[PDB]
Structure formats: C-alpha cells, structure tokens
Design a protein around this ligand. Structure first.
Ligand SMILES: OC[C@H]1O[C@@H](O)[C@H](O)[C@@H](O)[C@H]1O
Ligand SMILES: [Ca+2]
Length: 309
C-alpha cells in the first residue's frame, strides 16, 4: 500500500536544487505505491525543523532531507531516531561522526573537491589558450572569486581546490577580491558591480564563481560596464548556463549531475521505506553509507554532448 516519503528542499528558488526537486518528483511519478510530501524550507533551519516534526507526525516511512544548515544533521537524526525512521541526507553533506551515530542515516551527493579540481583544470586550459587574458602581462592570474555559503562542503572544497589545482599545475594566482554571494545571482551581480566601481576594476583578469547562478550575476554586471571581454567560470551546467557557454558569455562550467543524484536519493529512500536494504535491486555503489555521483567538466569543446540533444 501507500508508502509515505517526506522531502525537504532547503530553498525552492535555489537554481540547482530546483532541477533536483523536479527530477525527484518525476521519478516518484513512476512508483504508484509511493506518496511524496515535499516542503520548501525557505532557507531557514528553524522552519525545516518544524517541517520534519510535521512529517514524522504524519507517519512517513522515510525522510529525504536537504539541510539548510549542514551542522543541523544531529538535530534531524535525533528526531528520526525517535521513530526509528530512515533518513537519506542529500546535497548538503553532514559530518562523518553525524552519519555514524545512526544505523539508518545515509548520504547522497558528490566528492566536492573533484568539482574544484575540474574547474581549475578548465581555467588552466583556457588561460593557456588565451594569453590575451593576462592584462598586465605578469604571467599571473589576477582573479576575483564569488563564494557560496560559508561552511557548505561544496563552497569550501570548490574555493580551495580551484586555486590549489591551478597552483599545482604551475599557474601563479593573485586574489584581488573574495566574498560570498550565498549561491545567489542577485547578490553576485551587486558584489561584482561594487568591484567594477572601485580601485581594482581594471586589474581583474578572471572571474571564478562557486556556481552558475553566481556566475550569471557576474556576467550581467560585466555587461553593464562594457567589460564583456573578462572570462567567467561556474559550476553546475544549468541549462541556462549552457546557453552562455554557447554564446561565449561563460568560459566553462562543470556538470553537477542532478538527474542521478535525484534518482539515487529516491531509490535509497524507497528501499529503506520498504524495509529492503539501501541498494537492493539497484546498481548504486554505497561506500560506508554514502553514494557520490561524478562531476564532468563542460566548455565549448565538448558542449555538444551536454547541450540540447
Ligand atoms: O546546497 C546548494 C548548493 O549545492 C551545490 O552543489 C550547487 O553547486 C549550488 O548551486 C547550490 O545548489
Ligand atoms: Ca596578470
């Protein structure tokens, strides 16, 4: 009969989580016996905490949680523990100690650092092919970086590894500006606008963003100042971003595989909800209760296999 699964999305207007949400819903359409209770946490862990309580009260057989605050996994785990309900965390990764505290806690996401490394390699590649980009000809990349949420595993790894990778490849970098834009387009546009209206405006050579949404805000600000010749790099390969890659407005991005993260999340939840063991009848590779889906770099050179087909 009807298996109830509760799902929380940290914020429905997050561009990337918007794609993941729709894929989950689509995947559920195909499980006649399952009923999905979806909630928008409106970027507030307090609101999400209340939402979970409501869900548990409604007798869900499993929870699929997209945390507002990664540090709140213990809180959610104690709530789930009380009903001996399995919980599948996704996209915001909880601490390993957190995960180990409960036999029915699982995580579905990615190897965050890998996206950092891939982006670094794309920049390296394009920098090498465009010496015109070294405006002051010092052989150094004068960059600005638009960071996602502080403390967010993806934001921390992407920020560290894009620079580490460039430096490991023999490319020297000089940080002109670094600020968080919390994964949002509007805030990124305002930050970049500020940067283009200050003293360092003419020193900027490359714009690095932890995600596509922030990358798009930077593009708009560049355009407003007639500085469209400055390259921008992002992460996620959102359909909206692929068009900018096509256009030349974006230099490169990285596919964060929304469809397989959605599918893995749903399969585990359903199996656990059914009392069946997490990967049962699936090809997912679980490694100490975690599933990681690979990242893939994307630029003009291999666009044609991601772009509309
Ligand atoms: O947790 C939310 C964030 O997750 C990242 O994986 C993604 O790159 C960002 O755009 C944002 O969606
Ligand atoms: Ca330079």
């Amino acid at each position: 009969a009807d298996t109830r699964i509760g799902v929380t999305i940290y914020k429905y207007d997050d561009n990337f989580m918007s794609v993941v949400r729709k894929a989950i819903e689509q995947d559920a359409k195909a499980a006649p016996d399952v009923q999905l209770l979806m909630n928008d946490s409106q970027n507030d862990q307090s609101k999400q905490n209340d939402q979970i309580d409501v869900l548990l009260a409604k007798g869900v057989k499993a929870l699929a949680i997209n945390l507002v605050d990664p540090a709140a996994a213990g809180t959610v785990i104690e709530k789930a523990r009380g009903q001996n309900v399995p919980v599948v965390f996704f996209n915001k990764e909880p601490s390993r100690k957190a995960l180990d505290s409960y036999d029915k806690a699982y995580y579905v996401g990615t190897d965050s650092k890998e996206s950092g490394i891939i982006q670094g390699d794309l920049i390296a590649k394009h920098w090498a092919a465009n010496q015109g980009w070294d405006l002051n000809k010092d052989g150094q990349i004068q960059f600005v970086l638009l960071k996602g949420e502080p403390g967010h595993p993806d934001a921390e790894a992407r920020t560290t590894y894009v620079i580490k990778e460039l430096n490991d490849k023999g490319i020297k970098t000089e940080q002109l500006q670094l600020d968080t834009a919390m994964w949002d387009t509007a805030q990124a546009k305002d930050k970049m606008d500020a940067w283009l209206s200050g003293p360092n405006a003419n020193k900027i050579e490359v714009v690095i963003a932890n995600n596509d949404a922030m990358a798009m805000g930077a593009v708009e600000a560049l355009k407003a100042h007639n500085k469209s010749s400055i390259p921008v790099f992002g992460v996620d390969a959102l359909p909206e971003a692929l068009a900018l890659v096509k256009s030349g407005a974006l230099a490169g991005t990285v596919l964060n595989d929304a469809n397989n993260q959605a599918k893995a999340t749903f399969d585990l939840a359903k199996n656990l909800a059914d009392g069946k063991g997490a990967a049962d009848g699936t090809n997912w590779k679980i490694d100490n209760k975690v599933v990681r889906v690979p990242y893939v770099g994307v630029d003009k050179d291999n666009l044609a296999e991601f772009s509309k087909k």
